[PDB]
Write an enzyme that holds these catalytic residues in place. Sequence first.
Site, PDB file in Angstrom:
ATOM      1  NE  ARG A  60     -98.758  23.204  63.552  1.00  0.00           N
ATOM      2  CZ  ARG A  60     -98.490  22.025  64.103  1.00  0.00           C
ATOM      3  NH1 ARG A  60     -99.268  20.986  63.866  1.00  0.00           N
ATOM      4  NH2 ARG A  60     -97.443  21.892  64.895  1.00  0.00           N
ATOM      5  NE  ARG A  95     -88.061  22.948  72.540  1.00  0.00           N
ATOM      6  CZ  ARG A  95     -88.644  21.951  71.887  1.00  0.00           C
ATOM      7  NH1 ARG A  95     -88.526  20.715  72.332  1.00  0.00           N
ATOM      8  NH2 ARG A  95     -89.338  22.185  70.790  1.00  0.00           N
ATOM      9  CE  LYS A 127     -85.544  23.948  66.574  1.00  0.00           C
ATOM     10  NZ  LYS A 127     -87.019  23.988  66.706  1.00  0.00           N
ATOM     11  CB  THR A 135     -86.007  15.401  67.248  1.00  0.00           C
ATOM     12  OG1 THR A 135     -86.014  16.827  67.308  1.00  0.00           O
ATOM     13  CG2 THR A 135     -87.425  14.882  67.225  1.00  0.00           C
TER      14      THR A 135
END
Lengths: 513, 506, 503, 514
Positions: free
Chosen positions: B107, B60, B245, B303
């Site tokens: 962010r 990935r 996802k 994860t």
Amino acid sequence: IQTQQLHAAMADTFLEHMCRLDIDSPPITARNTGIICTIGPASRSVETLKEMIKSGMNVARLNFSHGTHEYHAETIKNVRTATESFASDPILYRPVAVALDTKGPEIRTGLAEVELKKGATLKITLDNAYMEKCDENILWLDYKNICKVVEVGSKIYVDDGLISLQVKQKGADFLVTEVENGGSLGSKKGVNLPGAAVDLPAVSEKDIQDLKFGVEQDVDMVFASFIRKASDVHEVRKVLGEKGKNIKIISKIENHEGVRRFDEILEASDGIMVARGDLGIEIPAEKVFLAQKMMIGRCNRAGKPVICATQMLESMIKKPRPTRAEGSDVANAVLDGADCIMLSGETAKGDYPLEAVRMQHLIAREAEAAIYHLQLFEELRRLAPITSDPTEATAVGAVEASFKCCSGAIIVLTKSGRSAHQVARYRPRAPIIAVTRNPQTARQAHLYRGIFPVLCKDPVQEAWAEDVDLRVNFAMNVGKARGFFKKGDVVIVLTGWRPGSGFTNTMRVVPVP
Amino acid sequence: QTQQLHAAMADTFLEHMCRLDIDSPPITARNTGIICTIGPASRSVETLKEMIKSGMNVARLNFSHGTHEYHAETIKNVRTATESFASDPILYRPVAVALDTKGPEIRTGLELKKGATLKITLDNAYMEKCDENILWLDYKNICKVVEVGSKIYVDDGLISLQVKQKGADFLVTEVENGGSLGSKKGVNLPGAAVDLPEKDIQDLKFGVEQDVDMVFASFIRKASDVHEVRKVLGEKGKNIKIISKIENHEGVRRFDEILEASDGIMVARGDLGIEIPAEKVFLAQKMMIGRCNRAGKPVICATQMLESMIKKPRPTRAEGSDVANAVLDGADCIMLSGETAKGDYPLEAVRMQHLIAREAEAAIYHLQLFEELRRLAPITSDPTEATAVGAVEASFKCCSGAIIVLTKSGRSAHQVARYRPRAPIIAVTRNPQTARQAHLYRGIFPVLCKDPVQEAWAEDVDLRVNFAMNVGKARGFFKKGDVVIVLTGWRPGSGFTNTMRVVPVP
Amino acid sequence: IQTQQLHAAMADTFLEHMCRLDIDSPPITARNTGIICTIGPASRSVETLKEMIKSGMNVARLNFSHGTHEYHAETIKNVRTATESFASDPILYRPVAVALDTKGPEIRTELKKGATLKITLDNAYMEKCDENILWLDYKNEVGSKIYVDDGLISLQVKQKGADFLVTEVENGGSLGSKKGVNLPGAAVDLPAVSEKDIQDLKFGVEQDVDMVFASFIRKASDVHEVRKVLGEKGKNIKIISKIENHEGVRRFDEILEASDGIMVARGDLGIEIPAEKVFLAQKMMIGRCNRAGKPVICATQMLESMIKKPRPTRAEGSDVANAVLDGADCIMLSGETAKGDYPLEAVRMQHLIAREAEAAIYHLQLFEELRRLAPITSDPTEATAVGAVEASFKCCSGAIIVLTKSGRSAHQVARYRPRAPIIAVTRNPQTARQAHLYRGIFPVLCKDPVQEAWAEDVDLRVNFAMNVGKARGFFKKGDVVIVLTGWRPGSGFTNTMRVVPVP
Amino acid sequence: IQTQQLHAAMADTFLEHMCRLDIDSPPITARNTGIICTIGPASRSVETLKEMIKSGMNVARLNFSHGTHEYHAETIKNVRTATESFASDPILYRPVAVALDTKGPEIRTGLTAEVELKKGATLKITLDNAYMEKCDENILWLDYKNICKVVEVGSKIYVDDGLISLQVKQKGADFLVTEVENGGSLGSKKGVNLPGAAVDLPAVSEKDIQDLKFGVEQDVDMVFASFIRKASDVHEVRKVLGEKGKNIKIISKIENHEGVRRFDEILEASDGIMVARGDLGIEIPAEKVFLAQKMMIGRCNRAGKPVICATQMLESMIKKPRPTRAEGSDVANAVLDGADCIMLSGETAKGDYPLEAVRMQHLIAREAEAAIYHLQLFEELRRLAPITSDPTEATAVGAVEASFKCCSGAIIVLTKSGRSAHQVARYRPRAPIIAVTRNPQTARQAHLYRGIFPVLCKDPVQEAWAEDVDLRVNFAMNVGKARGFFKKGDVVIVLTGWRPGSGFTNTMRVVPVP
């Protein structure tokens, strides 16, 4: 729109059951899986201890592998001071148990700015003057048969098996080794050997003093370390003796010999605890899940209490929220059939002990909803053996009726806990409220799944029929006050005929006052 | 006493668990795909070369820490390292290329305290002036999507801010969890439907030119995102496979259409953990794996599986458990985002995943799984679907070393993979993208025969069946006297896989 | 889902499956259960036999309890002449098998309750049998009982002893000579094969009998005696053991391993054992036989009223269905065909009840139960068959087409009890006749010349199977069917499964 | 462990369970399947009736198909007499129910004795009364005036209880012209079956109203209603019975294809169902009658309602002293099918061997109840059950589970209206349900449900309910000891209530027989 993962509960296939798990199906209030929290520098404060009971801690574990008798006693008094604080309201009161963990047979390094480098040589000296002053190339171990029973081509593990070594010499008192995985050596860190079963005493002299201290301390349970046969457990019982006959023994399985002789160990012990941090070093780590699932399963088919124990939420030693591998494991443990879930360093020497207990409280409650009870109950009954025991028939009947009417509880009058214990082996969704006057029973009952033990400090009415109902009313009030059930909701009440233990034969499905 | 065959025949799941042996050695073949995330830790070919032996099947690439030109050196490295073994086609191992988009993200600007009050503003100057006094965001529609009482999260969810007051471009929030404040931290808003729906188009359109097998889409919340992403890939990217996802509440809520639109689902636990109450994450993962399993569509758990292996050579026991449970849950592939993106111990982590997964695959209760899977599987007139279910039934009857499948688009092999066979599915193709994409499906062992097309189809077909037989013997899946299943066609082309032959291995 | 009880098949519980059964969910034209019709005065007629095959007869049973060889040979001549009557088109030709039911170790001979009974072993009265005059074949305890004429007339024998015992009748019945007498109390220790049975078995071999029905089997020792007496000239003759006593039920496991198949001979078993317990002995034997994969026959009184009545009783209809539901390979007609007034009507009823029941099986449980109990095997052929049966359910196959030389490959598919018809194509005529004994196997005789190229000969027999299924009504063009084959010619090599469209 | 088919019970597969069935495993003394015996000339005598009750009769069916109101009253008197001859000991008295089976509507062809129908011939079943007394091969006659209204072109007609088949190829008004389909000998007063039909005739004919009302006046305990095709027919039977017959139970008989496809509405409106197979086999294909019985018995087991199997079960026994092998099989599979009650008709009414056959129903059924796979049956009932707040329903399932766990010798239940016992029966235990009542009608009606053994405490009430509960439970213990059901040192499940009236039924006690 519904609760307790009930759409999944009635799924005809386990695969369908998973497809219907809903993060939008809020869980029931009561938590069945017990939370065991190791006490030490982070938690020994009555302030932390009071808040741990508040956050769902049910049992307190004391590790004699570290510490002194004075240190633990200060904690045991401290834990008991915290528990009596919430006793003004008996309904809001929660009994909290005290458990002792033996050091057991251990190999420990001698007394840090030495880092072992890959490509280096290490000699395991057996001169006992390096016990306080250990050099990198001169290492002293508190064992005498490492060199004798480990030969060239073997490997050694120190500090949680984080510093690996390879052996290139055999002899008396000395071992030339390579460092395959290197790092910062720590003082008196544990030594682990994958290729041998230690010859060290399963119950040492320190262990005899440590178990003896517990009998003087009124501990409700004990955690025996490095148990490889039933012979090891019997030695522990004789040390507990007549005054500790009622002290429950939970054998910690952390070795290949125990996993092989596990069936003999289970019949002998009062329960089992899967010690993963030690079990993983002895057997390859990728095989540990099988051992946990094998033992939790065997323990369930024998109605013996099983605990999942090590590095469940380890990141929380340094972090305020847990990793996803950790969250999954705690739930998978409850999904596997673990009666109790434990915390070690997270609670004993941790930055966030309270945060860890709360996480184990949430993830556990959610998993209990997720269980495929229809399949599980079918198998435990199908694999149940026909007995003429009255209590056993009443117990299985009560759980079947709890499933049929979706009870908000199963209320048991128990003096030794044995009546409530049998209902738990049948694994109900209904919370089990064991009404007892024997306090130790209330504490030891925390080991079983689903039992919410309640201590009736109310006096004997001198009429069994009045006394029994008085107790049944105490349970009804607690489930209401804690919000487990409501008035008009159905409950199961288990009782007997004659006063005294072993006379349980009465099953009552009743609405709540 | 191998492959947990004692537990395999147990009449009940509880008995099956009781029969789990630390001394039941598994088979050589591992079925659960291992997806490494590639980055500063292992862009290097020397490390990437070792991984292929170690077990990595998919490499990935993370856009969140990349530019549109940043990863090309890694892509050459993966390819050159993969192409090193091309000399022996039998020992050759295909490796897929995965692109994970940066996705809809938020962010902080470029030290913190607890139990406090902090304001957040949109003085765009705070982009080069991050401050303790106030935080700043690249998200301009926070006021539109945020609600009072919402919780704002910072530093991967360590930091939580409950909303108290708002304003024009500001929100006054209370800190419940304090910590260390840095810069450009991702912000997960668990009480929000993100307004962000052009920069993202560029990322997907560039994906086509890099000859990538699969695309993992960050932040998918509805089919419309999936229906759109394919178009960005284009006719040039018509075969590029999409894994949608799920890392948000909405994606979980309308999951079926997201899955139906997509070719796979990813359980993105780390973001999903902030977006949802973390105690309820496993409820989501088990729901997703089960539904994806039922729809015959690939699923990945991703994860934090072995996070401690980043700074330590030793996995935690819970980390060991999560990997195994995912495979037992039914997850087709497993991922190591952190351990490989900025990780200090990647080579062992692959083997650990390779070893835990190989142990759990035998621990799977195949009898209940296959029967429930077959009963739930609908009645079909598709000749291949019957040939597949039977080969899985035949493999259980003979405890097969492997099932040999000839496929051009992989569909034949994927169907056997749906029926979750214990036996490795050796899938033989002359399309290299097909073999790289096959890693998404649990059990398929992709093999690329580079042998020239024989003029005689019958001889050409036998050559692929022999090549695969040869690969398994070398790999150690089967031996003389073992029994294998062979799936072929009656005519050349795709859609004619109507042939199952049971061949005693010689 | 409106046909073949497909709505019941999708049930997750047996009870819901029962709740979902429909009298408007009609069956396929394929009947999976073998019909054995006993030949005799009402059935030997060539015209009557040619109608019985059309009706659904698959096997003809000859009873050697009664009859001379000359009579039976004329019946085999007639049956065979009547079987090749349909041979004009090989596609429509139904193979018909012939069975020999042994006389076995039998004891044979206006009555009122408590009436006089003085037994005579005076053989001068072999011709003479009266109210108190009789004879019993046996020449070998106090308080015991005796039963005569199918146990319909009973006797209490307080007085028993050295030679003959005189005791009061426990009941009364209409009587005929030469009647069954049975003793529940003792193990027979009597020759399963007599000198007569040996002469009959040899006549069978010279007569090319496909199956032999062995009588009064109590032990595996008895099963071997029939096998060896048939001999190498008769090694390939199928041996079926008939259980009519307690020792056989007790020693069933030992008999089954020896026997190629089993018959639950109920009529003598009901006299021998308490009759209320007979159903338990049948569901026992049929179930173990399915677990072993060996053929089973339920045989007595299944449509007894039809000897005199054009229609059966409700209990008679239920027994036939319950046998097929229990898992029985074959259903038997005895006097219903041999001396009945309605031989054709019974076969027509049995074919109809059998068809409905096969639709009413809960296959989902039966297949899963069969596989789980079944052992893991090296044999590619068994592995091919379990795959072919699961494949047949997923694709709702019209039929399973299997090329076989001995029947082994086709028998291997049948043990798993598929819904779809098994079309077993063989150039072996006896194997085709013997394939009836197994559920689902519809035997078809390829009358086509062996092709020089094996690939063509394989596809000829595969095409022939397709042509038969379309003509019988089993499947139509558009349907998908399962075809089993092998990598080479010869026995032991079946390992190929092809899901091909019907041409 | 070698008794009551206990080895076959332990199997984890139905095929293993079948493979493990043992003819050397003796059954329990208890027979849970009710026996319904038709009473006619063969058994009508008090002496024969006492012999029938001894042999296992639990219910007596009186057929209004034939017989006078006076005739049946005398048999009801005799049945009551024989039953009460055993009131000498309350412990050894078996309660006996009275059943009324309605004639319902029937259609007949009546008129030289027999004729033969050539295939495809011309036959007129016309409404002219000119040919009323002169039936012929060419012309036949049918009584019902509006048959012509309830039938139309293409309609199939069956004659002589299924023997001859016809199609109404030509339409006729107040007239019918048919073409013969199958042939046979034609008699007179023969019954006509209308297979695909639009019946409008009342299931309750005017005579039926007379019989039902006579029954309410007779203290009958159940009514086996005939030719029920819809719930309206069940509701009409109820309206005739009234509030004096509110307690009287309606068992709707299914003997037509309309009853089969409208079974769900009839069962909801009914207290029970009887599979009247003989009539149904004529109407629908005979081979399809098993599909009917299994679906109905199960949907009934699913519903917790009583189901009956009825016709030609031991038919050979009317003439011969022993049953056919097929006949024993039919009786057994009906218990394995899950039927609450098994019936005898002509075998007990006009047959030569009435007591031989009632004994055979008891013996076969006992063997089958042991041959049931209860692990699967309980699990299916538990899975298919609707979750309830009813504590009695939970207690019943819990007691049935506990009875399985302790392998009890009985489940003891105190009940006034009978429901408390009926619910333990719904969950189908291996253990006998000894049900204690003081209401004579409840005890009689309980035989309809599998497992319920009715005991009528005639013992007088005690001042405290607790002492009265203790006495009634002590009565059951004594009956079980006398019958052979259990022994001291055996474990039995006792079900009672917390206060009075028997609605609550929440107290399950596991106690040893003393």
